[PDB]
Design an enzyme around this catalytic site. Structure first.
Site: not given
Ligand SMILES: CC1=C(CCOP(=O)(O)OP(=O)(O)O)S/C(=C(/O)CO)N1Cc1cnc(C)nc1N
Ligand SMILES: CC1=C(CCOP(=O)(O)OP(=O)(O)O)S/C(=C(/O)CO)N1Cc1cnc(C)nc1N
Ligand SMILES: [Ca+2]
Ligand SMILES: [Ca+2]
Lengths: 620, 620
Positions: B184, B243, B365, B423
């Site tokens: 939108n 919107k 994650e 580490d």
């Molecule tokens: C920035 C923001 C919105 C804009 C959403 O825009 P969109 O384009 O995805 O959806 P629509 O145009 O369909 O509304 S709704 C919202 C709120 O605090 C309300 O939950 N916030 C704050 C916000 C910021 N960051 C996160 C992780 N969640 C949020 N809800």
């Molecule tokens: C899963 C992991 C790695 C693999 C990275 O693979 P890649 O393909 O990006 O790099 P290379 O093949 O070049 O090694 S290095 C590692 C650690 O704990 C060591 O920091 N970890 C666990 C890890 C999980 N999640 C985050 C957010 N950070 C991390 N470091």
């Molecule tokens: Ca929007």
């Protein structure tokens, strides 16, 4: 400024350099008994070409503000970072063998105690966001010639934070930014999802607005050419590589991530790699063009006192925006960042007055914090980022890494607690005190009125570490005079008498509920002391204990936050074991729900009536 | 079943439905005085077509396991979700006007106290990950015919978590999943970055492996057709919308996000929209094919007692993997998720023995937690997700929202504390106890040996809420008999005598350091009581105090965690004010660094020698 097209001898020297970097990565990790030599070896030609052909930097001054920046986003390749700074002549070669020792600063992952490291990495997927901040600063603030280079792994590209940074760089036309993708096919415990499907990497980078070049990542010639070409947008060098490249029998194999070579094997492999090196002569770094401007690092002072009057009503979220805009006239280093919430946090007031120093980060809190970290490196700016405090939980790993990065950033989270009312718990910050208190370099400001908010903004600007300012939605009365002096770690007693029977500690909305409870209790001849902590971290232990000893030892804490990790637990931890002191705790005991602000304060037991009832119970 | 191509009357009924949904969204938010009618109005035709042509569900049983799933990722459009469930006959139409009241369950954003809501949203960018978990469960676990539909905003697509989910769905070929993108043009405080560049949205979705269809989001006919064709890939319906569609003077305008219409305006607008409605007759929902299998709800028990031997060494991270694989043999409901760390967390043991129930989530994650939440909805699975505990900070907002979702998921984070050694801090969980204790539905297990770890896995499987198990890298002795009984909230005294001078509380590596300190102290004729909490939340307050009263009131807590929000603060908050009780706290006071595990325990003051020194200082 022209590309220097390398000759065959320069190319062979770059190959020789790459192979020296392999040997050192193996030697250091074998000496340590841990580390990631195969993750170093896939990047060896990339590192050689970056540091000894493409980049411009002062080899004896890695933090120099004119240098090109390099960000090792795949931080577990730290041994090859250390190797290049030895090759450049900054590090002693012998020190490389002390990798990961408690007597060394060549730690397992890069950290800014190293002069050649700006941001700590190690948590994957954060380096490109920091690089975006550096590049944005170079292009729009410093207006300097330096470029920014960020090396990522391919497994690393599964982190969504990376794609926030990709989108940011194309929105803001960061043509001075280069991402190098080490597509060595493998992650830690399996192949990376896309393996060597180079065309899919290219389509993803292009779809997010980057110029995407596929190269043989072990060809120094292809790397020189790809880095050399004129840039018109952020550029992704998508390098096809083999993990463990150059280690016979280990190259391209699983089961080797984070595994050092045993001594006998390292000796045999190193002999093989050495036999491929044609000359021991090293390449010298080339210094940069020195056009980064000087910046003023003096103490920052508001241009005038707050202009509130006792009794006026203003929400601290609005006072934050007014204070930040005012601070922008006090220092050219102040920048503001916000995640599509500027009309709610009131950072829009700064945008209106200093638009060239406001960065719209859109709905991407992870990247926003990383941008701020990048902007603060080498002390180039003083960043204030803002969103709802609840959505800073989205960026906790970035904030955690910001403290490991010894970063000086300021974060203001609005809409704290149940007092926001009808939006409900998804928008209510109830764990932000726990979160920010657990960040080791943090100072946690919880201003209770507009005056304390303006003073907190000013103090935060001059305070090192991770500063958090917790702002609120309800419009509460000004209680402080405009010339009240505030300090980190100093609380304020805002109501006291010789006949006080409890010290009630509140903050933000619960400070005002406590004052309202005091007026109610005076109708029953009950006086309470009321204490405003100002900073939850560090806590003013002395004033809290002095107050409690004047009020029969009794403390009651009341907070718009969950029980764990908040004000009550901070106070209990500070005073436990002191003779005669007791602490009673009112907080939010479960996930809340929608209602009017006053209704939710009542439902969850942190309003004036709950405070008064708690006080009555303590006396009897 | 064949697509029923709607005739002109069905299409007009769908338009009438969409306009009824507009009217209700306006009525409800004008009545509440807050809310997001313009965000509802852009989605009105999408919602009408999904609920009254495309999806199959029991209108009187929204939680029914055979139903198609709908996830409102842009949760602030909650009023139109409520309106469709009234239109379907589940909600009383009058109750829509009680939006956001403390007397209603029609809260500001969707929450699972509503039968028609599986996961709470409101924090943007999380719904698609939950939807992926639902679709993965439908295709590979339930092996049922239900489809999963997830509606997102366009500003929302700036969240990196969305793109983790996009990539997850194409890796796992979720051809039962549809993402609807409400393009939108506008976010909250400005246009969304891409505005109406529909081609760029299509390129990005396609680059991430989705079948991408651009549609007129206000054409019920184009929506019917786009939804009516199943695909072999996850499908992105990229809907060009305005919107505030249908609100004259507001459609496509800035400055209206989260702004309700004033009463006079709402009345005028509603009359205009009502004049467009051709018939009052409502469409009926169509029920699903009932092929989801039955799921047992019984207690899950390990097939045998633990089979460790007192004195044998095992790290609790390895005991976790052994215990999880063991539990997998007793119940088919157990599934495991890991983020490319299975060889480090030892969830690889479960993958080896139960590969069909392991989900590789790669280095993402955020999405991993959202997948687990989606898999646990309607109690279809019992998920255990794992990574390093430090990297669960990357998913704190997903964990926070999981509690608001009343989700039953289990999270095991390894590599806690400085005891991982070389580490360095990027990998060291030092704030995970603070984080998880602040999650209101959480149970926090910290097992100190292999026996306690197996018991914690079993207890966690049968415990509702957000269960966290903190595992460690050092290979410590088994200290518990295999038949030792463990319970949530019950600690263990693992060393005592009638002459104990301090109660020392430790966990994981610091429990074993405390036992080593006890041995050092006995040479000085000093006995100490040593207590293992087992769960940090809830805390066995009674056993701690009963122990302290046998040891002269003295408590010493020692933990491989920062000071704030961890074991020491939990203990201090539990015992503060109790007569004669004193608490000394040993924890990690700053960002650590690389070294051997024993060296770091000593440097940061939590090893056997620091413990003994603290005990010696207390007695003096
Ligand atoms: C920035 C923001 C919105 C804009 C959403 O825009 P969109 O384009 O995805 O959806 P629509 O145009 O369909 O509304 S709704 C919202 C709120 O605090 C309300 O939950 N916030 C704050 C916000 C910021 N960051 C996160 C992780 N969640 C949020 N809800
Ligand atoms: C899963 C992991 C790695 C693999 C990275 O693979 P890649 O393909 O990006 O790099 P290379 O093949 O070049 O090694 S290095 C590692 C650690 O704990 C060591 O920091 N970890 C666990 C890890 C999980 N999640 C985050 C957010 N950070 C991390 N470091
Ligand atoms: Ca929007
Ligand atoms: Ca890789």
């Amino acid at each position: 400024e022209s590309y220097h097209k390398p000759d065959q001898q320069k190319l062979q020297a770059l190959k020789d350099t790459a192979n020296r970097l392999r040997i050192s990565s193996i030697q250091a990790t074998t000496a340590a008994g841990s580390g990631h030599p195969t993750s170093c070896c896939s990047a060896a030609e990339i590192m050689a070409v970056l540091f000894f052909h493409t980049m411009r930097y002062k080899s004896q001054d890695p933090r120099n503000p004119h240098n090109d920046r390099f960000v090792l986003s795949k931080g577990h390749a730290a041994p090859i970072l250390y190797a290049v700074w030895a090759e450049a002549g900054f590090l002693a070669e012998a020190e490389l063998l002390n990798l990961r020792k408690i007597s060394s600063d060549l730690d397992g992952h890069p950290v800014p105690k190293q002069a050649f490291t700006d941001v700590a990495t190690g948590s994957l997927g954060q380096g490109l966001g920091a690089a975006c901040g550096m590049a944005y600063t170079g292009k729009y603030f410093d207006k300097a010639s330096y470029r920014v280079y960020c090396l990522l792994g391919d497994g690393e590209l599964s982190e969504g934070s990376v794609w926030e940074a990709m989108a940011f760089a194309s929105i803001y036309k960061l043509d001075n930014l280069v991402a190098i993708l080490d597509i060595n096919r493998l992650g830690q415990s399996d192949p990376a999802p896309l393996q060597h499907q180079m065309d899919i990497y290219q389509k993803r980078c292009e779809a997010f607005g980057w110029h995407a070049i596929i190269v043989d990542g072990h060809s120094v010639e292809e790397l020189c050419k790809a880095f050399g070409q004129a840039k018109h947008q952020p550029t992704a060098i998508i390098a096809k590589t083999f993990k463990g490249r150059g280690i016979t029998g280990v190259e391209d194999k699983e089961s080797w991530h984070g595994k050092p070579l045993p001594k006998n094997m390292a000796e045999q492999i190193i002999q093989e790699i050495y036999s491929q090196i044609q000359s021991k002569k090293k390449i010298l770094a080339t210094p940069p063009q020195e056009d980064a401007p000087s910046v003023d690092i003096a103490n920052i002072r508001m241009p005038s006192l707050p202009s509130y009057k006792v009794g006026d009503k203003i929400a601290t979220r609005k006072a934050y925006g007014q204070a930040l805009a005012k601070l922008g006239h006090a220092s050219d280093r102040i920048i503001a960042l916000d995640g599509d919430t500027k009309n709610s946090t009131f950072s829009e007031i700064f945008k209106k007055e200093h638009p060239d120093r406001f960065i719209e980060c859109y709905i991407a809190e992870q990247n926003m914090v990383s941008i701020a970290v990048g902007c603060a490196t080498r002390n180039r700016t003083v960043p204030f980022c803002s969103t709802f405090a609840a959505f800073f939980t989205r960026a906790f790993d970035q904030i955690r890494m910001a403290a490991i990065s010894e970063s000086n950033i300021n974060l203001c989270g609005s809409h704290c607690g149940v007092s926001i009312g009808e939006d409900g718990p998804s928008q209510m910050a109830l764990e932000d005190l726990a979160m920010f208190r657990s960040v080791p370099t943090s100072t946690v400001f919880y201003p209770s009125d507009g005056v304390a908010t303006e003073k907190a903004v000013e103090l935060a600007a001059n305070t090192k570490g991770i500063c958090f300012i917790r702002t609120s939605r309800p419009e509460n009365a000004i209680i402080y005079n405009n010339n009240e002096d505030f300090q980190v770690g100093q609380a304020k007693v805002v109501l006291k008498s010789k006949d006080d029977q409890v010290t009630v500690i509140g903050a933000g909305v619960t400070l005002h509920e406590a004052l309202a409870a005091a007026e109610l209790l005076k109708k029953e001849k009950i006086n309470i002391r009321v204490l405003d902590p100002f900073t939850i971290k560090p806590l003013d232990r002395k004033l809290i204990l002095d107050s409690a000893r004047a009020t029969k030892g009794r403390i009651l804490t009341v907070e718009d936050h969950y029980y764990e990790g908040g004000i009550g637990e901070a106070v209990s931890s500070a005073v436990v074991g002191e003779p005669g002191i007791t602490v009673t705790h009112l907080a939010v005991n479960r996930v809340p729900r929608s209602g009017k602000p006053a209704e939710l304060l009542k439902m969850f037991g942190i309003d004036r009536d709950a405070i008064a009832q708690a006080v009555r119970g303590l006396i009897t």
